[model samples]
Target: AEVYNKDGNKLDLYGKVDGLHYFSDNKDVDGDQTYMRLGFKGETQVTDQLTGYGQWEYQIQGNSAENENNSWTRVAFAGLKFQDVGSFDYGRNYGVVYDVTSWTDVLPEFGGDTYGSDNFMQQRGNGFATYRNTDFFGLVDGLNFAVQYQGKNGNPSGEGFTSGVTNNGRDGGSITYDYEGFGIGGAISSSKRTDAQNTAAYIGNGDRAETYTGGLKYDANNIYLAAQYTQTYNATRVGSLGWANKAQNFEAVAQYQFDFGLRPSLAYLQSKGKNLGRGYDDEDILKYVDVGATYYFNKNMSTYVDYKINLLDDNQFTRDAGINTDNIVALGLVYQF
Candidate 1:
């Protein structure tokens, strides 16, 4: 929704409210999973060739108690853009690796579990300075790139490893191309690991963490298909187990949208952890298949049902590590504006 648009200044509001429930054998995740998200986008034309823009998004936990801390900022950023040049911004934002992983993150629920937040250039976090250039300065069509730098967050002197202390500093970049409904992209990032992070049991003793990813996708003619592969060194977290010294992940999704406002999706994702103690060189941390569909009642309301078929084998290692091996189903009703 547009709140205002006059004199080159514009403001738009977007958000969603979701009532969700999960049916699962795992007691930890088998209850109400409701939430609400709200965000605003604002832009102002500073000159004929320059513009300023900002966005803020917040989410509230609908299932939490009134006295609990239930709301947090998902994204907040400001930037300046010059015509056909690029845009730069600083704040809490997504990591560059998402440029590739996001390709297969289309499932209605329980997708994109390989990468997470505050884990160094994999997902969203604080202290990011990003620059994005599209169309190669108007020379190459459908070619774009981004460069990003993230400052260190969290206290290095803390008691032990924490989410905030994962990265001491990092630098990364991504490049992508699109033409005729086909898209390909890759991203790589490396960061200095803090001492607190290296002290963990399963974490590698290396001084740095690294990630590399490649993805391909096609979206046209009511069909969508995407796939991505990623490898990380001392960067990815595995289930309840500690960080893996090395991790390999793959994800794929296929979907079709009908003319009658019904869309069905199928997806598969897997994460394998290596060098995680007890002579276990390789272990499946997360693996699942998602079957889901959405029926859009209108532009502002929809309902969805998602079934997660767990593929991880129940074993002594997984049980000891507190990993859930049961299937889950999710049902939701959403309203957006």
Candidate 2:
């Protein structure tokens, strides 16, 4: 993996290619699960106590032989690490809110959508991030922290702030603890998009999108359990029709790892709210039950089959892919390198 190293510096290239098929109502070959990615990481030791690092990652996305967005730059950032203190970084990375959201975003295929910690956009942004571990200043035995701030292309010319209807810059942080096979955490984030500029409030409002999430997890004796809940405010940019004021989302997961390289899991999610439709009511708008089994070939490769069913007619999962809300069958093969 280490392709180059000199002058107290090191560089490596890493990537993953995932093959997945969906049994939905309607979808093209291009619409299949084409999750291809590539990236690079570089680190340099500036001194005995100070070091610098940088990383650039991107996705290939759907199918396009001649892809224009080749260098997607999903994550492009650099930072410096200070021994015994902490680390500071600048550039795009997963938001802190995502740290807590990961607890229940465990499904193999369909997860981390409107029903998870992600409300409007994915739990990442083009911004700066800070990381601290339990080793920092000899903090609590199992305490860690993460924070992020993002400023994307936008303007207050039509924003609600500063007299003009503007948008809220994205930012968030999270704290987690782990000890004796038990863990707990929480996270919060606030953001706003300009795409709704000049749009109606019933749908898109400049009133920043906000979310709060918390979760607990335990792992022992080959059994794992996780549960999380997230609350969204002014999330009109999401929902079945992409319009909603608030929603309560919850998810639970249970999994067991057997010695025979087989892992079976069960997960359930429910998102309930009002006004999911444009200026209408949508109680229990989105809900789903997921059951899956994964076969591990080795430490670096695996395959999985997932079965998902929508408990509500308004399944955003299918709608996002131009399909109908209904039962779904999924299979995936992933190789990491």
Candidate 3:
């Protein structure tokens, strides 16, 4: 909801709570890190065609039953926008690599991490700044573009642990075109480790990497479908030139929502030429399919249930859940405000 103070500034507040239950083939029944967020947006018009805006948000471990006290930052930014030109903001937010791959991250269980959906660059960035323009060149009506930079001063991972200058140097950009119901986009990012980052890593100095990504999607009527691919190049020293072994990821998703409040979706993801990258973790090629349906109680609430099956090997995933099953089962409730 929104309200205006006597000063003529607009304020809006919002939040939601979700609950989850999950079971992998080889893992015991567990719950997702279901979470909740609270935030507000403030806007003001300093002039006619130009304006000012700012936002604040916090995410916390949430439960509809009992809210948790632990919380972390989500957004903290203030910026200006010019209707004919562009918009610029400084704060932490989604990265360019994230926006490129977000096209197919429609699963209820994941923001796209279930599979290798993103390059290992970063998720939300610190000391982040961004600029966006829509058909800025006055040529094509469907063209849009964005550029993002993560300074060495922002928190790349976790809360309150700010690393200035001794962090990773990351930067990237994306370009997208949309015509009616079809759209395509591409993005790239590079990350170099600073001495502090290397010294703080659990393994040998950190690994430097670069990523290239591309994606396309079509949506119309009740159907939504998308495909995205990413390639991560190793630039530092690691195993067997292991860091030399390039990693590839691909994802495909299709979904349909009916007027009667039933939604069905199918997604497939595959990863090759990379392990989990953990110091002692065992890994190999992995491929899996996720399929599920959700029953909507309303536009703001729904429950989803799905199962996943690995295409080739069951591995430990078979000995852990539901009498040694080889598939993963999940159920969750989602609430949006």
Candidate 4:
């Protein structure tokens, strides 16, 4: 069944099922396995300009130590919108930082290693609302802007705490410009903890950071090309420590559509993060390269394969404690209705 907003009163239900086989090898271990998952999402409009939405998902595992079938992850939030103004949303939602990077990738799922570089903004924390402005002074026809604010509660369990709020007390926004077959945009964001006395107690520190990104995609005869870049910076007591810890990521992809019921696609992505702080411990600088291809049997079903190599300059705590890397391969099937 399909959900609709016939009266401009929003109401909908959606879900998906995915299955995959993943294999990997590194300094610590190597293994192969299969996994599955199911998810549900729904939303309803309470008024002409206000609506609420939510999603819950769980993974399925059979007799494995890592199995946690009942565990669920939450996505998005319930909020309001204005026809020519913008939107106001609260609860857990995607960060402006993440919004910029995701637009340039061909990945079917969220949270893959390829997009996990410093360029990608993490998720939102609890408590706070965000406003996204609908652009009217259009340098581009469909251009738009956004700004978000999250408040802090001194309690460790408050919105700014890692264990308490996922994207708490963080603030940022984005600008998007779209016209015909071309699109480009960027986002900047920052976070701070209200209770922290010193940098040691900082929840990732009161680091005010910014992300810059842009992308372009073209569709001619069903073939497409896309690219994006992002960098993150933070101010430090010693003149911005995480500045050197910045990240850069890029991707390019090609795809072809066929009338005979088959569509094939391929993509390449690279990401790098540098100059991490001492608190990162065993973690070190990282560089990643990924290649993937997908085949669509029809509109509702598809199979895909992906390979990734991660190069690491291991830290003292690691077994190799030097240059180390891992290679991963994943095969998966997806269906939609």
Candidate achieving the largest TM-score: 1
List the candidates ranked by TM-score, beginning with the highest: 1, 2, 3, 4
Model 1, residue 223: displacement in angstroms?
A: 0.3
lDDT of 1 by residue, 1-337 (tens): 7888999999999899999999998898897999999999999999988999999999998988888986888999999998789989998899998888899898887788888877788989888999999899988998999999988675645454435543332218899889888899999998886665555554466567788999999999999999999999878865445566788999999999988888999999998987766566689878999899888899899999999999988877778567778899999999998
- List the candidates ranked by lDDT, beginning with the highest: 1, 2, 3, 4
Q: Least lDDT summed over 10 consecutive residues: which range in candidate 3?
A: 316-325
Q: What is the per-residue lDDT of model 3 for residues 16-66, given as tens digits with 9 covering 90 to 100?
A: 776766777455434464777878888787777777888888888753354
Per lDDT, the best of the predicted structures is 1
In model 3, residue pairs whose N, Cα or C atoms come closer than 3 Å (at least 3 residues apart or on different chains), thus clashing, are 26-317, 26-320, 126-154, 127-154, 239-242, 241-244
TM-scores, each model vs. reference: 0.93, 0.81, 0.77, 0.71
Candidate 4 regions off by >4 Å?
A: 1-11, 27-70, 108-121, 124-128, 134-140, 152-163, 166-171, 193-206, 234-244, 257-266, 278-284, 310-324
Task: Give candidate 2 misplaced runs (Cα > 4 Å).
Answer: 5-7, 26-31, 65-71, 115-122, 131-136, 155-171, 192-198, 201-206, 239-243, 275-277, 314-324
Alpha-carbon shift of residue 77 in model 2 (angstroms): 1.1
- In model 2, pairs of residues that clash are 158-165, 159-164, 159-165, 159-166, 160-165, 160-166
Off by over 4 Å in 3: 3-8, 25-29, 32-34, 63-69, 114-122, 137-139, 153-171, 196-208, 235-245, 274-286, 310-327
Give the distance in Å from residue 128's predicted Cα in candidate 2 to where it truly belongs. 3.3
lDDT of 1: 0.84
lDDT of 4 by residue, 233-256 (tens): 431111122222355556656667
**Model 1 lowest lDDT segment of ten:** 162-171
State, as a TM-score between 0 and 1, how close model 1 is to the true structure.
0.93
